[PDB]
Design a binder for these strands. Structure first.
Ligand SMILES: [Ca+2]
Ligand SMILES: [Mg+2]
Ligand SMILES: [Mg+2]
Length: 432
DNA sequence: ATTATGACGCT
DNA sequence: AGCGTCATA
């Protein structure tokens, strides 16, 4: 009744760049624009591994993780851009720098949480209050929402044959129902949130050339889900009211954090398929199976309610460099291990020095991780040491010292079992 | 032989 | 601390 919170206190958006690495390459090379395009890394093994795919290429069935030689079988005219290689390894600087361009624009509108290289959550609650005061009871025109979908609409009762017409019919029903006379209507707040996101998205495109999609809702999980409902180059508003129908057929794995083993457990243990089916369990029941924290989270989430705050953090918390040495390329000599630790340390030194200059901070811990031939785990071993100076030779020497005792080989010069992954990561930043 | 990342939870 | 999970291009 009157005491049951509804998770409608905030307006949160999730902005996600469309096929991000591809757009970065298309901006740089106009010949790639409006074409089936993919970004690949390395080239010698099966034409390289695809890591980003334009919407034109996806129509042919090209996906991430596909080998470019295989993608070419589906899409013979596929164009490719290759990730830059430096010091013998893929170097993602160009995309990191493009990400900064976008993140800096978003930060003009509101506080953001950098969630990945190409997406950020936005807390719009304050911005919405401000805009509502400016509007002074003024209705919101559909003209202010030119790329917005309202999830769940239109409903009930011939232009609806095409997608743009459906989008507009839905928007009109939504706005027709809105009560603009009340500065505290959650639905109104979401709508104004959407007006602001249109503006943010226009600014991103104007100032970078990059297009993005976005979700607008009352929390991060619904915002993220919403964003994916209409891509590319569109934004989606998911209201509290839309949740029961949306979740009624929504596979559990689609919700963020339930895409892996926990999500699988939920389905297996409870014998359900859809997020909405969770409402029939008590909070205690969910806690008994999935733990106190997850059980409480699931109980609220299946009702559209989540409280995780948009953290004020625009910069990454760690800076790392990693390389796999698959199959026959695994490092089997000490000279090999040392040469590559050095290559990695040199890239890391370069990124750290630039980070210190731009952002007034210094990393204080170096984390060293390796994988050994045979183990099916990301990392086999992880060891930290102190990071006291931005010097590549020192860092690589320290990394070797910390891992040297993993070498089974009774021989000094040989390395066994061979190493199939090296990883250096600078962490634990402090102001400088 | 997807690879190169990056955040956060557990004990 | 070191390990595991989940997620990004
Ligand atoms: Ca994206
Ligand atoms: Mg993304
Ligand atoms: Mg993606």
């Amino acid at each position: 009744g009157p005491h049951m919170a509804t998770g409608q206190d905030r307006v949160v958006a999730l902005v996600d760049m469309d096929c991000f690495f591809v757009q970065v390459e298309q901006r740089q090379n106009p010949h790639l624009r409006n074409k089936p395009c993919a970004v690949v890394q390395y080239k010698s093994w099966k034409g390289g591994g695809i890591i980003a795919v334009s919407y034109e290429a996806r129509a042919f069935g090209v996906t991430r993780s596909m080998w470019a030689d295989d993608a070419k079988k589906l899409c013979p005219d596929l164009l490719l851009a290759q990730v830059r290689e430096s010091r013998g390894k893929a170097n993602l600087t160009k995309y990191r720098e493009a990400s900064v361009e976008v993140m800096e624009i978003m930060s003009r509108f509101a506080v953001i949480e950098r969630a990945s290289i190409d997406e950020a959550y936005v807390d719009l609650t304050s911005a919405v209050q401000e805009r509502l005061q400016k509007l002074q009871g003024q209705p919101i025109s559909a003209d202010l929402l030119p790329s917005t979908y309202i999830e769940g609409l239109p409903q009930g009762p011939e232009e609806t044959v095409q997608k743009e017409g459906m989008r507009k019919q839905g928007l009109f029903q939504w706005l027709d129902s809105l009560q603009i006379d009340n500065l505290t209507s959650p639905d109104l707040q979401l709508t104004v949130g959407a007006v602001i996101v249109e503006e943010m998205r226009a600014a991103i495109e104007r100032e970078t050339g990059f297009q993005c999609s976005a979700g607008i809702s009352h929390n991060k999980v619904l915002a993220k889900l919403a964003c994916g409902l209409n891509k590319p180059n569109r934004q989606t508003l998911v209201s509290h009211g839309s949740v029961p129908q949306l979740f009624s057929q929504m596979p559990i794995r689609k919700i963020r954090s339930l895409g892996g083993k926990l999500g699988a457990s939920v389905i297996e243990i409870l014998g359900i398929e859809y997020m909405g089916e969770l409402t029939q369990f008590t909070e205690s029941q969910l806690q008994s199976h999935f733990g106190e924290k997850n059980g409480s989270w699931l109980y609220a989430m299946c009702r559209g309610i989540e409280h995780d705050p948009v953290k004020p953090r625009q910069l990454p918390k760690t800076i790392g460099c990693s390389k796999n040495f698959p199959g026959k390329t695994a490092l089997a000599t000490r000279e090999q291990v040392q040469w590559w630790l050095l290559q990695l340390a040199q890239e890391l030194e370069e990124r750290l020095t630039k980070d210190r200059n731009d952002n007034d901070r210094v990393a204080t811990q170096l984390v060293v991780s390796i994988r050994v031939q045979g183990d099916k785990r990301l990392s086999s071993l992880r060891r930290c040491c102190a990071l006291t100076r931005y010097d590549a030779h020192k860092m690589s020497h320290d990394a070797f010292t910390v891992i040297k005792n993993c070498n089974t080989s009774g021989i000094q010069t040989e390395w066994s079992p061979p190493l199939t992954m090296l990883f250096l990561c600078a962490t634990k930043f402090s102001a400088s």
